[PDB]
Design a protein around this ligand. Structure first.
Ligand code: MET
Length: 512
């Protein structure tokens, strides 16, 4: 049948206001999903939210709300954003749903019966704003009193770390140390980019995998341990199983789970890769489940010094295509990006409105002026330049694909704009207005317009994963009504338009 592809975003904390960093994660996963659906995969694209823990409970407590009411309100605004960004997620998984909660209970009960989980006491440091256990030496701005650390802050968030000293269940992750290390030997590509692996092994595995405190006795808000209801399951164990619980794991019908698991990519930001690539594999080893194929960790979007840009405000001012394009263009593979408002409008006005927007405008006007809208049919590479430009178009599809497969979206986008820049330069080289003056050069004039439009069609098809408005408008104004000419397989042979087409007599702007 159709080959499967399962890609996931991380499930986010409904903590206040989403930022372009979480919008990047969701837009990039959508670009993957849309891209894979265009290639003829059976794609499942999952996102969701992380609703349990002390952090969320304190936020709802501070708000003067219940957890569900506070959550329901935050989740409503999160989903408002995804609908506006136009995310093609096949499912949305909330951890407060019983279809999730029952899987967390059964996974915990099972690990207890295996002897993988045992009871004890965690003493040490914890950042509730990070939901992360820390050791003495990991603390930032530590407090020494008679040679002993009695306080500090989190290296991630910079928030004050608090002392934990309570009864807790421990997942024996220490005994999977060599098996996880052997997994990295067999599968060195597991973490993409590979540059993020060695720091993560050096910081988190080398000093010794301490057993992970996987339950909590102090707070109330979370999945309760069924054998011992006073214990509430740790948020990160609770959260991690959303990728399998949403597929119907440990239900009557695991047909969706057998189909889509293991996941092809787990997409995330670089500060939560330790959970998905140490704990998440060790956990699946304990459940005897096949591990993920990739864990793509992307960089941050900095603010000219360090890390309050609202996606909503960008979409309202400059449109969706501008905001979506900017995100994928300005964050490279293995790098962080800077948001500057100057950089944003340059990318919106010069790349979209001018380079692509005015290419379609220049082309359609010349077809209206020189042929009254009747765009001539494609014959062949009749012009001197056509042969290497047609090869350029097929190399653009080739190079783009290689960039899309290795998760280099800014390089694929720069490759496509190289081609759009060429197509604009083709107007300057051919000088169609000089061909229009001669009656014997009508055949060559029509060749240039047909190549102009076929170059645009190539670009619009390649931008369908990235841009959800522009290609669709481009086909309407050009009057390309065949939905097969909007697919990737129509780019295999240049010059698909063999019958003439009546283009629009009222060309309107593609971009706002
Ligand atoms: C299993 S992914 C959990 C991610 C977590 N909610 C975060 O915001 O970092």
């Amino acid at each position: 049948a159709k080959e499967t592809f399962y890609i996931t975003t991380p499930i986010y904390y409904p903590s206040g206001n989403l930022h372009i960093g979480h919008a990047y994660s969701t837009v990039a996963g959508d670009v993957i999903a849309r891209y894979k659906r265009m290639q003829g995969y059976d794609v499942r694209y999952l996102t969701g939210t992380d609703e349990h823990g002390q952090k969320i409970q304190e936020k709802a407590q501070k708000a003067g709300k219940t957890e569900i009411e506070y959550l329901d309100e935050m989740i409503a605004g999160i989903k408002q954003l995804w609908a506006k960004l136009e995310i093609s997620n096949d499912d949305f998984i909330r951890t407060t749903e019983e279809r999730h909660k029952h899987v967390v209970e059964q996974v915990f009960e099972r690990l207890l019966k295996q002897g993988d989980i045992y009871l004890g006491e965690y003493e040490g440091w914890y950042s509730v704003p990070d939901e992360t256990y820390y050791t003495e030496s990991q603390l930032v701005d530590p407090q020494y009193e008679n040679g002993k650390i009695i306080g500090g802050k989190s290296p991630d968030s910079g928030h004050e770390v608090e002392l934990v000293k309570e009864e807790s269940y421990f997942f024996n992750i220490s005994k999977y140390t060599d098996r996880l290390l052997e997994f990295y030997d067999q599968n060195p590509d597991f973490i993409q980019p590979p540059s993020r692996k060695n720091e993560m092994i050096n910081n988190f595995i080398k000093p010794g995998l301490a057993d992970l405190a996987v339950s909590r006795t102090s707070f109330n808000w979370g999945v309760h341990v069924p054998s011992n209801p006073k214990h509430v399951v740790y948020v990160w164990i609770d959260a991690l199983v959303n990728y399998i619980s949403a597929l119907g794991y440990l239900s009557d019908d695991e047909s969706l789970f057998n189909k889509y698991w293991p996941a092809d990519i787990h997409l995330m930001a670089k500060e939560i890769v330790r959970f998905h690539s140490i704990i998440w594999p060790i956990l699946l080893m304990a459940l005897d489940l096949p591990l993920p194929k990739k864990v793509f960790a992307h960089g941050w979007i900095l603010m000219k010094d360090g890390k309050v840009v609202d996606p909503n405000i960008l979409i309202d001012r400059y449109g969706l295509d501008a905001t979506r394009y900017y995100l994928m263009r300005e964050l490279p593979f293995g790098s962080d990006g800077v948001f500057t408002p100057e950089a944003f409008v340059e990318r919106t006005n010069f790349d979209l409105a001018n380079d692509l927007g005015n290419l379609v405008n220049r082309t359609i006007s010349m077809v209206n002026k020189y042929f009254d809208g009747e765009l001539p049919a494609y014959q062949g590479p009749l012009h001197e330049l056509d042969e290497e430009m047609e090869a350029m178009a097929l190399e653009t599809v080739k190079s783009y694909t290689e960039s899309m497969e290795s998760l280099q979206f800014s390089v694929a986008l720069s490759t496509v704009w190289k081609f759009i820049s060429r197509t604009n330069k083709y107007i300057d080289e051919t000088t169609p207005w000089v061909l229009a003056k001669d009656d014997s050069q009508k055949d060559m004039l029509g060749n240039v317009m047909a190549h102009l439009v076929e170059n645009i069609r190539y670009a619009a098809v390649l931008l369908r994963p990235f841009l959800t408005h522009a290609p669709k408008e481009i086909f309407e104004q050009l009057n390309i009504n065949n939905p097969q000419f909007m697919e990737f397989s129509s780019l295999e042979q240049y010059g698909v338009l063999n019958e003439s087409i009546m283009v629009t007599g009222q060309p309107k702007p593609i971009f706002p």
